[PDB]
Motif scaffolding. Structure first.
Motif, PDB file in Angstrom:
ATOM      1  N   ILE A 194       0.233  -5.047 -11.272  1.00  0.00           N
ATOM      2  CA  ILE A 194      -1.157  -5.404 -11.540  1.00  0.00           C
ATOM      3  C   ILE A 194      -1.484  -5.159 -13.006  1.00  0.00           C
ATOM      4  N   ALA A 195      -1.002  -4.043 -13.555  1.00  0.00           N
ATOM      5  CA  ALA A 195      -1.195  -3.780 -14.975  1.00  0.00           C
ATOM      6  C   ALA A 195      -0.491  -4.838 -15.811  1.00  0.00           C
ATOM      7  N   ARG A 196       0.695  -5.262 -15.374  1.00  0.00           N
ATOM      8  CA  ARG A 196       1.397  -6.338 -16.059  1.00  0.00           C
ATOM      9  C   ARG A 196       0.561  -7.612 -16.035  1.00  0.00           C
ATOM     10  N   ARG A 212      -8.658   1.417  -5.343  1.00  0.00           N
ATOM     11  CA  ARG A 212      -7.903   2.424  -4.609  1.00  0.00           C
ATOM     12  C   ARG A 212      -7.394   1.802  -3.313  1.00  0.00           C
ATOM     13  N   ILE A 213      -6.776   2.628  -2.477  1.00  0.00           N
ATOM     14  CA  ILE A 213      -6.299   2.142  -1.179  1.00  0.00           C
ATOM     15  C   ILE A 213      -7.503   1.736  -0.337  1.00  0.00           C
ATOM     16  N   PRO A 214      -7.488   0.578   0.321  1.00  0.00           N
ATOM     17  CA  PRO A 214      -8.693   0.128   1.025  1.00  0.00           C
ATOM     18  C   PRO A 214      -9.121   1.123   2.092  1.00  0.00           C
ATOM     19  N   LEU A 239       0.808  -1.212   0.000  1.00  0.00           N
ATOM     20  CA  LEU A 239       0.000   0.000   0.000  1.00  0.00           C
ATOM     21  C   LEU A 239       0.843   1.265   0.000  1.00  0.00           C
ATOM     22  N   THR A 240       1.859   1.346   0.862  1.00  0.00           N
ATOM     23  CA  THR A 240       2.723   2.521   0.847  1.00  0.00           C
ATOM     24  C   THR A 240       3.388   2.686  -0.511  1.00  0.00           C
ATOM     25  N   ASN A 241       3.702   1.574  -1.177  1.00  0.00           N
ATOM     26  CA  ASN A 241       4.192   1.571  -2.548  1.00  0.00           C
ATOM     27  C   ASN A 241       3.111   1.123  -3.524  1.00  0.00           C
ATOM     28  N   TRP A 242       1.850   1.424  -3.208  1.00  0.00           N
ATOM     29  CA  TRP A 242       0.736   1.005  -4.051  1.00  0.00           C
ATOM     30  C   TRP A 242       0.927   1.447  -5.495  1.00  0.00           C
ATOM     31  N   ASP A 243       1.502   2.631  -5.702  1.00  0.00           N
ATOM     32  CA  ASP A 243       1.755   3.095  -7.061  1.00  0.00           C
ATOM     33  C   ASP A 243       2.623   2.102  -7.823  1.00  0.00           C
ATOM     34  N   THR A 244       3.701   1.629  -7.195  1.00  0.00           N
ATOM     35  CA  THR A 244       4.553   0.645  -7.850  1.00  0.00           C
ATOM     36  C   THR A 244       3.808  -0.662  -8.087  1.00  0.00           C
ATOM     37  N   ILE A 245       3.065  -1.133  -7.083  1.00  0.00           N
ATOM     38  CA  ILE A 245       2.364  -2.408  -7.216  1.00  0.00           C
ATOM     39  C   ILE A 245       1.349  -2.357  -8.346  1.00  0.00           C
TER      40      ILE A 245
END
Ligand SMILES: [K+]
Ligand SMILES: [Mg+2]
Length: 222
Positions: free
Chosen positions: A108-110, A153-155, A98-104
Motif C-alpha cells: 500500500i505504501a508502494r 487499521r484492521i477492520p 489481514l493476518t499479513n496486514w503488516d506486509t500488505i
RNA sequence: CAUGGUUGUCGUCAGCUCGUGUCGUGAGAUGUUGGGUUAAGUCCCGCAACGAGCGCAACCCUUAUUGUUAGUUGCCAUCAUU
C-alpha cells in the motif's frame, strides 16, 4: 426493508438441492423445482438485526470491510462501500490480507509512492521503459489493493458475500476474531458467520439490495 | 582429514534461499507449483500466499556504421616537385 423487495430482488432462490448444506435447514423454507427457497421471514428479521448491528459498529467509529469477488457482487459492493466511506475488496482477496496486514501495508505504501510520482512529475522525466513499467505496477496495486488503500487499521467488521466462495476471507476473520456479516446461501455454513443473512448470492439485484442496506446502516450510524 | 587465502568442478547450468503470513501434532509444506513464454526462477496470467535477497538480465570492455573536435611522427584527393 420489505419482504416484497426481497422477493422482487430474487433473494429467495438458493442453489441445487443436492448441493445444499444441512445446517441451512434452520433457514430453508421449502424446495421448488429442485432448488431450496430461503425463509424470507427469517431473512427480514435477520437483515434488520444486521442493520442494527452494523449501525452499532458504525456508531462505535469502527471500520468496515466489504468483501466479494463473485462476478455478480464485485461491482455492487464496490459502489456501496465507496458510498458508505468504508473499504472494500472486490476483485481478489489476497491471502494474508489481514493476518499479513503488516506486509500488505508495504505494498500500500508502494502504491501511495507510485501515485506521488505522477503528481510530482517524476513520470514526465522518467525513461519510456521506466514510466510504462511503473504504470503497469500501479495498475496491479490498484486492481488488487485499490479498495483498501486508505484502510487505517484492521477492520472492526467484515461484510462478506458468499463465504463459501470467499473461503480465505472467512479464515482470516476467524484468526483475527473479527465479526462477520455474510449473505449466506443454502449451500453455505452458518456457524462461521456471527450475523447471518440467509439470501441468494447469485442474484445481482439481491446483492445490491442487501449490500445497500448494510451501507446505509453504516452511514446512519455515522 | 586442524586452517586462512587461492583454485578446479558441475556450469554461465537457472537455480539457491530468507522475512511475514498461512497449512501440518511433527519433520516439513506453501511462495519457487500450475497455463503460457523465454537463453534464463525471463516475463505475463492464476493461485494462501504477499514480498525480498543471491543468481539471470542490465550497467563494463572489444568488434561492426557514423557526426563533431583534433591533423603529427599519421593520411595524399585536389595541386607542382621527388
Ligand atoms: K516461510
Ligand atoms: Mg529472477
Amino acid at each position: 426493508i420489505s419482504m416484497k423487495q426481497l422477493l422482487e430482488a430474487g433473494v429467495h432462490f438458493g442453489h441445487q438441492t443436492r448441493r445444499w448444506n444441512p445446517k441451512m435447514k434452520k433457514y430453508i423454507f421449502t424446495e421448488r423445482n429442485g432448488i431450496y427457497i430461503i425463509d424470507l421471514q427469517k431473512t427480514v428479521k435477520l437483515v434488520d438485526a444486521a442493520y442494527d448491528y452494523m449501525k452499532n459498529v458504525a456508531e462505535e467509529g469502527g471500520v468496515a470491510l466489504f468483501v466479494g469477488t463473485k462476478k455478480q457482487a464485485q461491482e455492487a459492493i464496490k459502489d456501496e462501500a465507496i458510498r458508505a466511506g468504508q473499504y472494500y475488496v472486490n476483485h481478489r482477496w489476497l491471502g494474508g490480507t489481514l493476518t499479513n496486514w503488516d506486509t500488505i501495508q508495504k505494498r500500500i505504501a508502494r502504491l501511495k509512492k507510485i501515485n506521488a510520482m505522477e503528481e510530482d512529475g517524476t513520470f514526465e522525466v522518467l525513461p519510456k521503459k521506466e514510466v510504462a513499467g511503473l504504470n503497469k505496477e500501479r495498475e496491479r496495486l490498484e486492481k488488487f489493493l485499490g479498495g483498501i488503500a486508505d484502510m487505517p487499521r484492521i477492520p472492526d467488521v467484515m461484510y462478506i458475500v458468499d463465504p463459501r466462495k470467499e473461503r480465505i476471507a472467512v479464515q482470516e476473520a476467524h484468526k483475527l476474531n473479527i465479526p462477520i456479516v455474510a449473505m449466506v446461501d443454502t449451500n453455505c455454513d452458518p456457524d462461521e458467520i456471527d450475523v447471518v443473512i440467509p439470501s441468494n448470492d447469485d442474484a445481482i439485484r439481491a446483492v445490491k439490495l442487501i449490500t445497500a442496506k448494510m451501507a446505509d446502516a453504516f452511514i446512519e450510524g455515522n
